[model samples]
Target chain A: MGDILIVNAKDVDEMLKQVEILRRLGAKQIAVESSDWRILQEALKKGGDILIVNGGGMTITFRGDDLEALLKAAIEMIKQALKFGATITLSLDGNDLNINITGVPEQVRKELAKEAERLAKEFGITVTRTGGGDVDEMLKQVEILRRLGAKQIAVESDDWRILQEAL
Target chain B: MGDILIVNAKDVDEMLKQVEILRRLGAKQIAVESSDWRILQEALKKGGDILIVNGGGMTITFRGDDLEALLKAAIEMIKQALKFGATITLSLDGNDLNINITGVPEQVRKELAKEAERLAKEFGITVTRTGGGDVDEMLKQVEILRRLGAKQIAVESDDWRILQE
Candidate 1:
């Protein structure tokens, strides 16, 4: 119910791992940033006794040997995330592809994110991305998600800058 | 062309940092996994000779939640991965959901893996999956991908079981 920090991770184990770390580091209000609804179910099940802040999103990058082909693939990946009910944004820099996936249904966010990763991998390109956040970027993404109707966000990150500022 | 290991990181600096670790760990040939093409450009700029592999993918799980909704999402995700010329497979165990992605293009492999992780993060669900080979599951995925027409592969993982075996 207080201010929440976003913790990003690729899977539940890692997500919970980050949450424990955040709690140990003295974080009182925290939220797991994810597309999976199970987090929300757990959050709701725990009622108000937990520090979980509710929110979710995905950010990832891709690059490779074939620049032109990579670009085309990036566009295809974005288009795919969109069909799954994830509101997505992309920043394409030549062959480098960056995508931010959000607005996911709680019931399917985790599956959707994993599939996106697999799709990019099957294409055989370099992909680098994680679920954590930065202070400025977190705020910016939160603002966008709120505008699109996300509520009850508590964010956390492994990035020292974000931790220093928020936690 | 030599055996290559893919290292995943959040950004370029970390990608390079992992590459260093791999080198120190006796990895003879390696590639920094990332969505940033500048790494490749830099590699090329410094290259006497290097062969970059072209392949990408992800494996993930879902447990103890709405299986129907998860299934719907999984199918949608498979459809998405498929359009990019990647082969996908799924195995559902009661409440547990498992999906694998392979047959990626060379340029976007690392980036795609990271995004998959981030996507799981976004969903805030429990997932258990890894890249690399040796497990029956891993071999099955490889075999299916090959039959489906994939030619090359590069896998990475954070799990120690995968690292050891």
Candidate 2:
């Protein structure tokens, strides 16, 4: 019922489709990870909102001083976690979840509980951890989250971003 | 230059496509794990080779000596490991591994590792402890395995079953 988003697709078109499908599924509002800067830009140009970004690529140029300021802070968080190669899927509050991931290296996935807890507090959301293990276990968490009052979900490509964000 | 067989859709398909793409770019040859029984059967059917099963839905028929013997063993290993909520990925080499997963139900992963190693040696193979953490980490080791004497390659699906003997 509320606004949520999902991100994925290492390729450009696929990335766009991630947003596209969610939109078709009836998402009145959304934000995206700007891996494919052009896709992110075009999505906004065509009417999108908010921006959860990773990498220092010049693809994203946040508008409005306040929004830009907020994203600037979020960007730092992404850089800190993703640089170590971790895909973060956090389920926060009800069926709504937000995912943020990058490269999926090492160490990051193993030692992500702390970062996840911190993000959950700042975002006013909850966090669920799925380390790319059992699909069934992940799905079970999804069910639990949905039961708790999750009505929306969002993700970031690259790794656990989708899982963490879905929370 | 030997008989190398491929099996299962999930085995050779989903996982291999990515690795094969890398191989053509100049990677090395190594064995892979498949939860699919077809992978083991196909490899054995092709004859003259050992099979490495990394991960899959086993637990169902681990002790069964019927039809798919290797698969029986593979599934059994998967069962013991999974019983403790341990996450073992399907690797490119037929080499099966155990890390004694920490942080589970009373060292369930650790106990599973003990059982796995015991069974592995029974098959006359040792469970190679590569300190593997996850899929990406296991994949990074492909080259090292190649250097250790891996020839050709094979990928098996978790559902892939060897044709009934």
Candidate 3:
């Protein structure tokens, strides 16, 4: 009920096309691209202005003007995770950063903060980080990042709860 | 909590000073400024980025990029109230618009929507119309405007819940 609140969840072909159109419309960094419903849910939870276009997919983006602060925010998260004993690696993929997680998945939970920073740095994205295997620990650190000023968040997990609590 | 939000409570002098500073910081319009505590309470409930630098005053604001859509949103809320039956009057007061409410207080709620359109037209402010007395209807319509899209909302009621609930 908090003010500030998309994604097409019914089709696949249109989702791909929608992504392309948004990329052209200025999606800047593709915060996330996944089958996990949590990513979209997290976007809605944050209450940023959004556009949801989906038949069977979802893509959440922000204004081009917001890129710098967004990237700085992500970097802030990664640095925080490093302090909490988490190891990370990030890669730039199109407008989105692809991340892989391992080592103490005890602090930065959602599995994507580092990549968010990587791409955000290259494409003006957003960030802050924390996580772990259990939803309890993960959400705890995510709470820290929120305090640090990462306006939007991106999350993915095969386990629904990790992503679910992400919101 | 949705990521988008904006507001704050009472005081007269500090509120005005705060508005000018933010205007320089790129706030196109004064979204809401009132002695009413309810306005600030609602904003606090909806967590988001905010600045509260008060030695002895208050002010809340939002960016003005959505002016066009924002104005349309205020007007939409006012027009909705008129249908429910509430007499409304709007006047421009420098940077802010003054609204007076009367009649079936159960329908239109607090009265400020139409003046939003007037100021919006001249300075890209925000809009709508109607109500009073019982104030329930007035606040109800006000809620519609808030939901519709007036990022900044101003109310002058002394009752905390009238400003609160």
DockQ of each: 0.02, 0.02, 0.01
The candidate with the higher TM-score, 2 or 3, is: 2
Q: Provide the fnat value for model 2, as a fraction from 0 to 1.
A: 0.00
Chain A TM-scores in order: 0.40, 0.30, 0.27
Give the per-residue lDDT digits (tens) of candidate 1, residues A58-122.
56667777655555555566445545544444444445555555534333445555665676677
The C-alpha interface RMSD of every prediction is 17.9, 20.8, 23.4
Docking quality tier of model 1: incorrect
Off by over 4 Å in 3: A1-167, B1-7, B33-165
lDDT per residue (tens digit) for residues B8-121 in model 2? 123434334433433344323222334444543443333313334332222211222232333334445544443443323322122222122221333354456566566655
Q: List candidate 1 stretches off by more than 4 Å.
A: A1-56, A131-167, B1-165
Cα lDDT of model 2 by residue, A1-167, tens digit: 11233242223454455466656767665544333335545555544543323321111111222432333333344435434433222111123222334234335544554665565556554455333433354345445434543333221122222222222
Candidate 3: tens digits of C-alpha lDDT, residues A1-167 = 11211122212333344444444555443222223334444433433233221111112222234434433443443344444443322322233322223323323443344445465566555433322334554454445546644455433221221223333
> 1 or 2: which has the higher TM-score?
1
Better of 2 and 3 by lDDT: 2
lDDT of 3 by residue, B40-77 (tens): 33332432132221111011111145534442433343
lDDT of 1 at A118: 76
| TM-score of each model, paired residue for residue | 0.25, 0.23, 0.19
- Minimum summed lDDT over a 10-residue window in model 2 chain A is located at A55-64
